[PDB]
Amino acid sequence: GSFVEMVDNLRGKSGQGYYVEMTVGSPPQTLNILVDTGSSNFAVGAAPHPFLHRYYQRQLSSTYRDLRKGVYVPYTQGKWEGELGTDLVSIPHGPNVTVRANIAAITESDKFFINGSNWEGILGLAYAEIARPDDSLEPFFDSLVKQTHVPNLFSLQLCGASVGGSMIIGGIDHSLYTGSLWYTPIRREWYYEVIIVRVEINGQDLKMDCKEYNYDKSIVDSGTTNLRLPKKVFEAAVKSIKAASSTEKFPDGFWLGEQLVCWQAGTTPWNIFPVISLYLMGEVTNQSFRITILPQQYLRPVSQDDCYKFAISQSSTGTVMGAVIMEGFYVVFDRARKRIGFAVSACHVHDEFRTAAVEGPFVTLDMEDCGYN
Numbered sequence: 512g513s514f515v516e517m518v519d520n521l522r523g524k525s526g527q528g529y530y531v532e533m534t535v536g537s538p539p540q541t542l543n544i545l546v547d548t549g550s551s552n553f554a555v556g557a558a559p560h561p562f563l564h565r566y567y568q569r570q571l572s573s574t575y576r577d578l579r580k581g582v583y584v585p586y587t588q589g590k591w592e593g594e595l596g597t598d599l600v601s602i603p604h605g606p607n608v609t610v611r612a613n614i615a616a617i618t619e620s621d622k623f624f625i626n627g628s629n630w631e632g633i634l635g636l637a638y639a640e641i642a643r644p645d646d647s648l649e650p651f652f653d654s655l656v657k658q659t660h661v662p663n664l665f666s667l668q669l670c671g672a673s674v675g676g677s678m679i680i681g682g683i684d685h686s687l688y689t690g691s692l693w694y695t696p697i698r699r700e701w702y703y704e705v706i707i708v709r710v711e712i713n714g715q716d717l718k719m720d721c722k723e724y725n726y727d728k729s730i731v732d733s734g735t736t737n738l739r740l741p742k743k744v745f746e747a748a749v750k751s752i753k754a755a756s757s758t759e760k761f762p763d764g765f766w767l768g769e770q771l772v773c774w775q776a777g778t779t780p781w782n783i784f785p786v787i788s789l790y791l792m793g794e795v796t797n798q799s800f801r802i803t804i805l806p807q808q809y810l811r812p813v814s815q816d817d818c819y820k821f822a823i824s825q826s827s828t829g830t831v832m833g834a835v836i837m838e839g840f841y842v843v844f845d846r847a848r849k850r851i852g853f854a855v856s857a858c859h860v861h862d863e864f865r866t867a868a869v870e871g872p873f874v875t876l877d878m879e880d881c882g883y884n
């Protein structure tokens with residue numbers, strides 16, 4: 512394929528995020544940068560920090576322009592602060608272009624950088640609406656599309672377990688997937704917001720009002736590890752997953768992520784755990800499709816023992832389809848056509864009895880009733 516040089520341009524550690532090399536300034540300064548479809552700022556470590564091997568040195572970059580305004584990104588659960596500027600940015604294993612992008616130079620942070628993650632910054636790939644300090648700060652990808660002829664599309668193949676993957680910028684690599692691509696509309700351009708219309712555990716409908724699946728939003732977020740579900744959905748899903756996997760018993764805290772369970776090397780009974788199906792709104796009236804994930808996806812590896820964390824968790828800010836979901840699939844962020852495509856990944860981690868799937872079409876009525884207003 513023509514996109515060959517962008518294949519396998521992602522690295523990472525399990526549960527710690529996928530990152531791509533980005534080259535900033537003049538002369539060149541290359542950093543490892545977290546690929547995050549759940550935020551909208553391009554920001555880099557710019558001062559020494561215990562968890563950073565390298566950082567951005569603005570004084571050494573002749574093309575760096577100070578924007579003379581501070582920037583702060585808040586969280587649950589930590590934060591970072593820095594200075595706004597612009598500089599020249601290229602992706603050596605991405606598109607053959609160089610753009611002047613907004614860059615936040617991180618000078619202080621709390622619980623942002625992860626010990627041993629090997630990334631030194633973050634690439635916010637979502638829309639300007641959620642950018643800090645506000646929506647006037649053009650996100651990187653917006654700059655890329657405005658300044659170059661790179662098509663308004665990227666795609667992600669995240670390969671789970673030391674992890675790897677591909678970010679194809681400007682197109683779709685057909686070697687990265689099998690079968691067909693199925694598209695769900697981007698409801699609104701802020702986060703990558705989608706609509707979930709039905710949930711099944713081992714083919715059994717969870718039978719909740721579909722509004723609950725998308726309260727108060729459902730997003731596709733490459734920077735979040737887990738499948739995160741609204742409290743009511745989480746509880747019903749856990750109750751159903753428990754009942755489906757009853758050939759073995761697990762402590763209550765396992766389902767809450769407070770306890771881990773370990774198996775002797777290569778003896779994890781994947782077969783005892785159910786498959787989970789998320790149905791997404793399709794592109795045609797009353798039409799949906801489903802993506803199916805294996806226990807290999809939602810049980811994350813954390814001696815001769817393999818330890819696993821239950822990687823479905825509770826959320827009070829909507830559903831978050833994180834890496835747990837994305838790792839089964841080749842995921843197309845077709846910004847040009849306001850839609851997200853899903854196909855079975857060529858690097859899909861499966862066993863000999865079951866496989867991750869993207870299947871359709873299905874008939875689902877009143878799907879418009881499922882969205883939060």
Ligand SMILES: O=C([C@@H]1CNC[C@]12CCCc1ccccc12)N1CC[C@@H](c2ccccc2)C[C@H]1c1ccccc1
Nearest residue numbers: 549550584585586588589590591622623641732734735
């Ligand atoms: O939710 C996120 C991202 C979205 N995907 C992964 C995320 C979610 C899970 C946590 C996390 C951790 C590291 C990197 C990414 C992410 N944010 C970016 C960084 C985050 C932050 C975290 C810790 C300290 C300071 C800032 C603030 C937030 C944010 C997003 C959008 C607007 C404002 C803030």
